[PDB]
Design a protein around this motif. Structure first.
Motif, short mmCIF file in Angstrom:
data_model
loop_
_atom_site.label_atom_id
_atom_site.label_comp_id
_atom_site.label_asym_id
_atom_site.label_seq_id
_atom_site.Cartn_x
_atom_site.Cartn_y
_atom_site.Cartn_z
N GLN A 87 0.72 -1.14 -0.07
CA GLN A 87 0.04 -0.05 -0.04
C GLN A 87 0.94 1.16 -0.05
O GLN A 87 0.85 2.20 -1.06
CB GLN A 87 -0.96 -0.03 1.23
CG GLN A 87 -1.94 0.96 1.37
CD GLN A 87 -2.79 1.49 0.19
OE1 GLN A 87 -3.47 0.93 -0.41
NE2 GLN A 87 -2.71 2.79 0.32
N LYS B 6 -14.79 1.34 -6.56
CA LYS B 6 -13.77 1.19 -5.45
C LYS B 6 -14.53 0.88 -3.95
O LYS B 6 -14.22 -0.27 -3.49
CB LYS B 6 -12.88 2.30 -5.11
CG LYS B 6 -11.85 2.62 -6.11
CD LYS B 6 -11.16 3.82 -5.67
CE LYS B 6 -10.31 4.21 -6.80
NZ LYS B 6 -9.76 5.86 -6.18
N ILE B 7 -15.55 1.73 -3.68
CA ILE B 7 -16.39 1.46 -2.27
C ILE B 7 -17.26 0.19 -2.51
O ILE B 7 -18.03 -0.25 -1.59
CB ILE B 7 -16.97 2.75 -1.68
CG1 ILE B 7 -17.45 2.68 -0.49
CG2 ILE B 7 -18.03 3.33 -2.77
CD1 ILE B 7 -16.47 2.23 0.62
N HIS B 41 -6.82 -1.23 -0.07
CA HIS B 41 -6.40 -0.20 -1.03
C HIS B 41 -7.56 0.49 -1.66
O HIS B 41 -7.17 1.77 -2.08
CB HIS B 41 -5.69 -1.37 -2.11
CG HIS B 41 -5.05 -0.33 -3.16
ND1 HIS B 41 -4.06 0.49 -3.10
CD2 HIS B 41 -5.06 -0.84 -4.68
CE1 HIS B 41 -3.63 0.72 -4.29
NE2 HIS B 41 -4.20 -0.06 -5.31
N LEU B 42 -8.71 -0.24 -1.79
CA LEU B 42 -10.02 0.36 -2.44
C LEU B 42 -10.47 1.43 -1.66
O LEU B 42 -11.15 2.36 -2.12
CB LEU B 42 -10.86 -0.74 -2.67
CG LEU B 42 -10.37 -1.66 -4.02
CD1 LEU B 42 -11.74 -2.47 -4.31
CD2 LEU B 42 -10.06 -0.76 -5.31
N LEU B 43 -10.31 1.10 -0.25
CA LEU B 43 -10.79 2.38 0.81
C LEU B 43 -9.53 3.39 0.81
O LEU B 43 -9.60 4.29 0.94
CB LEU B 43 -11.07 1.62 1.95
CG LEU B 43 -12.31 1.12 2.50
CD1 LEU B 43 -12.68 -0.24 1.33
CD2 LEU B 43 -12.26 0.44 3.74
N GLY B 44 -8.21 2.84 0.85
CA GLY B 44 -7.16 3.33 1.17
C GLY B 44 -7.04 3.98 2.73
O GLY B 44 -7.49 5.00 3.03
N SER F 25 -9.55 7.52 3.10
CA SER F 25 -9.04 8.37 1.78
C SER F 25 -9.65 8.37 0.69
O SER F 25 -11.21 8.17 1.10
CB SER F 25 -7.63 8.03 1.29
OG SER F 25 -7.69 6.84 0.64
#
Lengths: 147, 98, 49, 156, 49, 49
Positions: A87, B6-7, B41-44, F25
């Protein structure tokens, strides 16, 4: 009601009052990430400058200091996490892993292999990665060189 | 475009997280990363938080705070909970933003 | 160094959420609390707003 | 090989004439930098000092006949600064990756790290760009405008 | 504590333990048993951690 | 069928992770989390209602 004592204290004497305290304290000391400093007396004469090694020898054995140095070398101190690599570190080594995610163990060996760390400073298990001293905070440093 | 998807897709992912019985305590942790990362990742969100703190959260005791490791089924269930938390909140976000 | 004990704990706590307790050991003759007056003073130098 | 087309030669001149105020047929080791800049190159100061230009005015002057080799040299170079090399760094400045980083936080670091900027170079770039009434300067359109250049579609 | 806590009810919190060392004397009462007992237990807090 | 309803009218997750997800984010991923309009901010203690 409660078939007991109630107003004033219960029938809680100084001991009981202080024992309640004595539990909370110990528990809340267990609830945290403990950090330790061991300190050594140099002599009993109250003398600055002078130091006696029979006293340090006897100190090291009893307080188990030798054993401490013995465990840090053998252990793997930090049971932390794999995704923390890919990440954050995309910035450091962009072409570490291509399109082709599969055994996440094998994906991570490749990313960490590109940044050249053998799998014994960071130890693997199943879920988690163990970090020996430096290793996680060398990874942080590697990003934070360019950063 | 990429952001609504993504979400959306993490909720398809998540239930991939395989908790498994390690009977010395029964505090299971889940066998991988891929399953979690394709969510993460898709949330980050901070990876170092997710895979620690899901099993070991800062338990508010009344108003003070004591760490706990969680037992196998509570975690599986809370992870399934994480999916039902994401979808409910988003469609309600979406209808207003529509 | 003392300061080098403190910063290591701090940013770890700030990353990983783990609150902590530092504990000095020793017998009666060495120097425990002695440090702590300098620990507090340093903690106010970083803890400052 | 590397070489300069005739169009490139005229551009180098067309600016040079304006830069040499005095008429010595010559520019200075400072001017070398801001020339390459106006000419639509972007070297660093480290690149200028890699190849023989300077901070201070009043040491060594260069001709166009010294300049055109240097101009041919920079034409070989890769390490100018890409979108990627920038997108790298912006992503420590988002306290949680949105695009919207903070104006004054940007200001402290530009004064601190890299080459180092001035008070002036900080305030000018902030005042030049998109300040919303919170102060969330967008790291990526910002960079993309740096890549675009001085004058957009509004000739302003 | 009344004057220097300005933020009741919030976390995080940190600690620095501060106690004596190995001390012994004749007249045991409610007092001295607390000291060596905690030095022992604090060694034990090492061992277990 | 009634066995279950209670948990469908209490909804139990993990606090620390969705609070840390609030610190997320990707813009849209973030918006989905808080008070100000009124969606999550989802634990701690609004007083007992």
């Amino acid at each position: 009601g409660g078939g007991g004592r109630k107003k004033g204290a219960s029938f809680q004497t100084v001991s009981a009052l202080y024992r309640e305290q004595l539990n909370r304290l110990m528990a809340s000391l267990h609830s945290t990430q403990p950090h330790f400093v061991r300190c050594i007396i140099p002599n009993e004469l109250k003398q600055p400058g002078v130091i006696d090694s029979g006293l340090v020898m006897h100190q090291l054995t009893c307080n188990g200091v030798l054993e401490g140095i013995r465990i840090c070398r053998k252990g793997f101190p930090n049971r932390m996490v794999y995704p923390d690599f890919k990440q954050r570190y995309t910035i450091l080594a962009a072409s570490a892993v291509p399109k082709g995610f599969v055994d996440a163990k094998k994906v991570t060996e490749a990313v960490l292999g590109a940044i050249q760390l053998d799998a014994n400073d960071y130890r693997l298990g199943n879920t988690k990665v163990f970090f020996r001293a430096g290793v996680l905070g060398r990874l942080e440093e590697m990003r934070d060189d360019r950063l | 475009k990429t952001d609504v998807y993504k979400i959306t897709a993490s909720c398809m992912h998540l239930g991939e997280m395989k908790f498994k019985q390690r009977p010395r305590e029964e505090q299971a942790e889940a066998d991988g990363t891929e399953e979690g990362e394709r969510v993460a990742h898709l949330l980050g969100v901070n990876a170092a938080d997710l895979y620690k703190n899901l099993v070991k959260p800062k338990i508010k005791v009344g108003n003070e705070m004591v760490t706990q490791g969680r037992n196998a089924t509570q975690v599986s269930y809370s992870v399934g909970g994480l999916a039902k938390a994401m979808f409910d909140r988003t469609f309600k976000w979406l209808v207003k933003r529509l | 160094h003392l300061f080098a004990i403190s910063d290591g704990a701090y940013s770890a706590m700030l990353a990983n959420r783990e609150n902590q307790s530092m504990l000095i050991t020793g017998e009666s003759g060495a120097g425990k609390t002695e440090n702590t007056k300098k620990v507090i003073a340093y903690y106010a130098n970083v803890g400052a707003a | 090989m590397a070489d300069l087309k005739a169009a490139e030669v005229e551009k180098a001149r067309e600016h040079f004439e304006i830069y040499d105020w005095e008429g010595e047929g010559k520019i200075d080791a400072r001017d070398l930098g801001d020339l390459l800049r106006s000419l639509d190159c972007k070297p660093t100061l480290a690149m200028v000092k890699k190849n023989g230009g300077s901070d201070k005015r009043g040491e060594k002057k260069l001709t166009l006949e010294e300049f055109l080799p240097i101009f041919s040299q920079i034409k070989k170079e890769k390490e100018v600064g890409t979108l990627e090399d920038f997108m790298e760094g912006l992503k420590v400045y988002d306290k949680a990756e949105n695009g919207t980083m903070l104006a004054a936080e940007l200001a402290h670091v530009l004064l601190s790290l890299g080459e180092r900027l001035t008070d002036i170079e900080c305030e000018e770039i902030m005042r030049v760009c998109d300040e919303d009434d919170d102060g969330f300067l967008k790291y990526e359109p910002f960079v993309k405008t740096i890549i675009a250049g001085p004058f957009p579609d509004e000739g302003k | 504590n009344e004057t220097l806590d300005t933020k009741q009810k919030r976390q995080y919190f940190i600690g620095v333990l501060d106690i004596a060392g190995f001390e012994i004397f004749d007249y045991n009462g409610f007092e001295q048993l607390c000291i060596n007992f905690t030095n022992e237990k604090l060694q034990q807090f090492f061992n277990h951690h | 069928n009634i066995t279950g309803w209670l948990e469908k009218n209490k909804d139990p997750v993990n606090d620390t992770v969705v609070d840390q997800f609030k610190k997320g984010s990707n813009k849209l991923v973030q918006e989905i989390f808080e008070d100000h309009p009124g969606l999550g901010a989802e634990e701690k203690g609004g007083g007992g209602k």
